[PDB]
Design a protein around this ligand. Structure first.
Ligand SMILES: Cc1cc2nc3c(=O)[nH]c(=O)nc-3n(C[C@H](O)[C@H](O)[C@H](O)COP(=O)(O)OP(=O)(O)OC[C@H]3O[C@@H](n4cnc5c(N)ncnc54)[C@H](O)[C@@H]3O)c2cc1C
Ligand SMILES: Cc1cc2nc3c(=O)[nH]c(=O)nc-3n(C[C@H](O)[C@H](O)[C@H](O)COP(=O)(O)OP(=O)(O)OC[C@H]3O[C@@H](n4cnc5c(N)ncnc54)[C@H](O)[C@@H]3O)c2cc1C
Ligand SMILES: COC(=O)N1CCN(c2ccc(F)cc2)CC1
Ligand SMILES: COC(=O)N1CCN(c2ccc(F)cc2)CC1
Ligand SMILES: COC(=O)N1CCN(c2ccc(F)cc2)CC1
Lengths: 587, 586
């Protein structure tokens, strides 16, 4: 138990010192290591409940039971006198740097999870390399270090959402007494894209500075695992070479899919292209119905565009469908058009005017599920029909890393693959929520287990979400239909209410469009299984409740907690109308 | 135990039916009731663990052990055959309206707590009266039903705050690509006030409709408790009369204080006057440093006002003082002036308010700093120097209701006063947080205990707050200095971080928003207090109040995953401690 933890900790830590807080010889060694700029993990035995047992077990590697003890890459180096001997004879630097491999850790992929992993490992003395490369889109779009969220994901899309929200702030200002006239105000796409891209640029640079200041080697190159410890790299000049590493973290993410139809790749674009597009898209068709499709359609319409969404079957498959229909109804009432139960079968009418900074012109032909036809012209067509990894680019099949039927990596609950020294984090880890804070937590927690003797695992259950559509939708836990399927309708009670933000009263906005509900389990003390809210600032509302749901909140916990007034969130503390009762939820 | 609960429930319930969910005789009685429109409480014995014991105990009142049993005001009325007998003989209506008193419940005060209590009691058949009167301010201001929050508190102040927030939204819009020019846009005070007051009017009307639809008698009259069961009322024609009630709820609230200096009452105003003022205040002095003082100075500045705040000692006394200083520093950097360590001595009138042309007057303010140096013109002077009840106005001293040294009512943990049928809720309940949602919870829970046999008490601990200053401040639990005083500095660990809202990046400050968790080392790093300075701070704070109620630790925050991109997610990854000395900047 303790013995197996200690053996695992010693074998994989790069440089680790076993210590006690009260020990003067330990402080002498800490100071030497600090002077020579040798980074290392430290385990203070007096601060652990079984530190006495650990102390005795150390003798199985060192033949001594005393403290301090210093190890490098699985080898006992010495006690106080011996470490200082090596320091005085200028032998220490060579001892702590000798390794069977070029790196203690190679991270393939410089995005949300990979950068978090690599930085955290280097803190504990692991010699670390992070590899990142951005394969260009079909039209040639590329970007800098930081991954999908930073460059073509959460960051630009929420900034563009904020630009859309400010349109309603302009309308509301007149009712609150400000003298502007919203009717005579227009939006400039390229001005906003320039501001968004300058912020993304500051993030690209910040990550390069962070890696430098943690002594992490950054290679802007494509990585390919050719055996358990060997990574083949290809640089911007297509120069090929090989580097070796003890532990390997795969963190290469996904890219957008295109449907297999004529004209899609040639004449459409994806979210990869939209966030740096040099011209306003114009009249736009969005194909798909995921959160990416609806978020992009939403801000495009708020910025004055003529927007249509083509929906194969339902909106937001896998989310609570009552909430998904309320989201879509709001968008349709506020200027988004929908072509429902429809799929595309794309012709070019005009080439993109790269001179005068203007889109082209396209003819889209499709059909509905009953057989009727769709035919209409658009200036821009955006495909948002899912994302996929392409691990054949990354991972030679002879290495032995097992994939599932979707091409994602099959992992243990500590992110280990079928190859003992290789791990996977983020969007390519099969079965896990595909979110940036999940990738960051998995990467940091893994680095600590590998190089600092930590034990804590990442918890992937009940991870909260928010969809940043024009009216936002936050959620934590089960949808209502999944709860009913798992426990039966008679064991589920749902409390719900409409509400109206105080900010919407003077502005003459809608009375009964915002909505929230708690999905509860009767036979388990009215345990809250899922929380759902449609309204402004839905992510800020939802976050804090995710802590309560993690700790097992019941309806009675929500009832005994007092509201903050006036807020939207306080409506969760006084819910009382049940769905079974038939009483209206309106306000 | 069970017997003492049943005796208490039967004695004070107005109309109550003991019943079982599967009981056709019970269901037949339920139909006769409210076919005759008779409202009542119901207790389903098959849904309680000690329901068997309760059933046997009923026989001590009725001499029977079966269900249904109907009671009216402590008297057994009958089983199924007997109730139906009274119904078809037209004797039932008189039975259920028989009372020693005019009302089962009289509520003195029609605000947050009192309206909540009154509506809830009426749901279970209590014959209920709610009394409300608004004593005019020194300049004559008055308003409608609903209390301080609705008319001159949370509701108008947050709407004016939103008007102020929209100024920076107009600024931000240009950076996000919108073509407007903020420097050419101005604000019209009277247009704002008209919209705020139209919303307040819809609330006044909605409460009158709510009381009508619940069969509550609304008397627009001033009430005075003259004996345990007698309330003297004075109407708007100064006609005096007396009504009697079984239970009495005192819910009369507080009003603003003035300092005892020349010219204060005659020439200054308070928050009671500000929210319906027909002219813009102009150059304004706010005297005080409470949340009311800072919230009002903050939105006046954002709407284009020249505003100064006179601070006697510190900002937000009773709140975490690191947080209070950051709130004030932000205000001073964004155009609020502060006269620190200063108090007023006298207000002189230089011009009378110009009610024709709808303009303020002009005043000379004289005061002094704590070292003796002198302070010496403003168009408006607003006093925000605290609030107080005035129960020697509501409550004759011979009734026997005990007050504390501040004049608030000393209550048990079930809101009972020293007079057994008299209760108090809301701001006048000594020692309790003075907040609208607390008063509502206290009033509703009390009505259920009086008239439906409920047992649940209101929990007043760890109630979250938000100060709606220009940059908002939310909190739940102890301040850092209070935690250190209670447990010692070596048992307290503070995790903290600055942050920048993503919305602020394209809009161009980096390190002004701030958050911290104050934790107890020897209790598994229990979260004692949570604090956040930033946009939407009340929306951020609310959900965490549930987790703190359940006893959240630092480990609970760590294992919960963030939502990205939000401000709130910074709470899920905090790691810099104050003891480490590492900078919290980002
Ligand atoms: C439009 C959009 C909006 C989103 N909005 C949100 C949101 O609001 N909130 C949220 O939580 N999540 C959001 N997400 C999801 C979030 O972006 C991902 O979950 C997250 O980026 C995944 O992190 P990762 O480390 O797994 O991969 P990535 O961040 O994709 O990083 C992987 C990196 O590795 C590189 N790479 C690939 N192959 C190789 C190779 N062979 N050699 C070297 N480098 C390679 C890739 O080019 C990329 O740079 C959004 C996603 C999209 C597409
Ligand atoms: C400027 C300001 C801003 C505030 N902002 C907030 C905020 O954002 N959030 C929050 O939670 N709280 C806020 N509060 C506090 C909140 O208003 C009070 O806590 C709450 O209104 C108290 O409710 P109550 O029922 O105790 O009394 P009140 O709401 O004051 O109601 C008492 C009523 O009884 C009437 N009355 C008095 N004497 C008699 C009598 N003899 N006969 C009949 N009627 C009588 C009074 O005129 C009044 O109408 C604010 C307060 C102020 C002053
Ligand atoms: C077909 O040849 C390849 O395998 N390549 C092409 C060159 N790539 C690259 C790497 C880094 C960079 F900055 C720009 C481009 C990597 C993959
Ligand atoms: C000094 O004489 C009093 O006791 N008064 C005067 C009349 N007041 C009143 C009541 C209701 C109303 F709508 C307007 C005014 C009550 C208090
Ligand atoms: C201390 O000042 C702030 O925090 N401000 C900055 C601007 N923000 C805002 C508010 C409403 C809106 F519609 C658009 C932007 C938030 C409030």
């Amino acid at each position: 138990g303790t013995s197996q933890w200690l053996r695992k900790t010693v074998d994989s830590a790069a440089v680790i010192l076993f210590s006690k807080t009260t020990c003067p010889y330990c402080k002498k060694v800490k100071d030497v290591l600090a002077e020579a700029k040798i980074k290392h993990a430290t385990i203070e035995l007096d601060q652990l409940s079984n530190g006495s047992a650990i102390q005795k077990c150390l003798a199985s590697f060192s033949k001594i039971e005393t403290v301090p003890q210093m190890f490098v890459r699985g080898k006992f180096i010495g006690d106080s006198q011996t470490v200082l001997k090596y320091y005085s004879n200028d032998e220490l630097a060579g001892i702590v740097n000798e390794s069977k491999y070029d790196y203690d850790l190679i991270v393939i992929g410089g995005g949300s999870g990979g950068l978090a992993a690599g930085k955290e490992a280097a803190k504990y003395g692991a010699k670390t390399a992070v590899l990142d490369y951005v394969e260009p889109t079909p039209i040639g779009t590329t970007w800098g270090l930081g991954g999908t969220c930073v460059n073509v994901g959460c960051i630009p899309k929420k900034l563009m959402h904020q630009a859309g929200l400010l349109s309603h702030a302009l309308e509301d200002a007149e009712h609150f007494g400000w003298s502007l006239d919203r009717s005579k105000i227009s939006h400039n796409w390229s001005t906003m894209v320039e501001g968004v891209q300058s912020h993304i640029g500051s993030l690209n640079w910040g990550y390069k500075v962070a890696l430098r200041d943690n002594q992490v080697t950054y290679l802007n190159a494509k990585g390919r695992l050719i055996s358990p410890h060997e990574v083949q790299i290809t640089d911007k000049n297509q120069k090929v070479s090989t580097i070796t590493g003890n532990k390997i973290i795969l963190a290469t993410g996904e890219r957008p899919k295109y449907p297999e139809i004529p004209g899609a790749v040639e004449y459409g674009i994806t979210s990869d292209d939209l966030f740096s597009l040099p011209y306003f898209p114009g009249k736009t068709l969005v194909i798909g119905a995921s959160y990416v499709a609806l978020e992009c359609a939403g801000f495009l319409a708020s910025l004055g565009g003529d927007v249509t969404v083509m929906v194969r079957s339902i909106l937001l498959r896998g989310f609570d469908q009552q909430m998904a229909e309320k989201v879509g109804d709001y968008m349709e009432n506020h200027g988004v058009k929908f072509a429902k139960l429809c799929v595309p079968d794309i012709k070019q009418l005009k080439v993109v005017d790269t001179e005068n900074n203007k889109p082209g012109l396209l003819l889209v032909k499709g059909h509905y599920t009953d057989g009727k036809k769709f035919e209409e012209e658009f200036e821009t067509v955006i495909f948002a029909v899912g994302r996929e990894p392409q691990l054949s680019k990354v991972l030679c099949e002879t290495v032995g890393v097992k994939l599932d039927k979707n091409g994602r990596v099959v992992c243990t609950d500590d992110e280990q693959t079928t190859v003992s020294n290789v791990y996977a984090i983020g969007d390519i880890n099969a079965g896990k929520p595909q979110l940036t804070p999940v990738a960051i937590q998995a990467g940091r927690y893994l680095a600590r287990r590998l190089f600092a003797g930590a034990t804590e695992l990442t918890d992937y259950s009940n991870v909260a979400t928010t969809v940043f559509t024009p009216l936002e939708y936050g959620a934590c836990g089960l949808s209502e239909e999944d709860a009913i399927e798992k426990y039966g309708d008679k064991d589920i009670e749902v409390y719900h209410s409409n509400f109206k933000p105080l900010e919407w009263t003077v502005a003459h906005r809608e009375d009964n469009v915002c909505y929230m509900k708690l999905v509860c389990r009767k036979s388990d003390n009215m345990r809250v299984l899922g929380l759902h809210v449609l309204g402004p600032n839905a992510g800020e509302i939802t976050q804090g409740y995710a802590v309560a749901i993690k700790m097992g909140a019941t309806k009675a916990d929500f009832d005994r907690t007092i509201g903050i007034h006036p807020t939207c969130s306080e409506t969760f503390t006084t819910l009382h109308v049940t769905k079974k009762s038939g009483v209206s939820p309106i306000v």
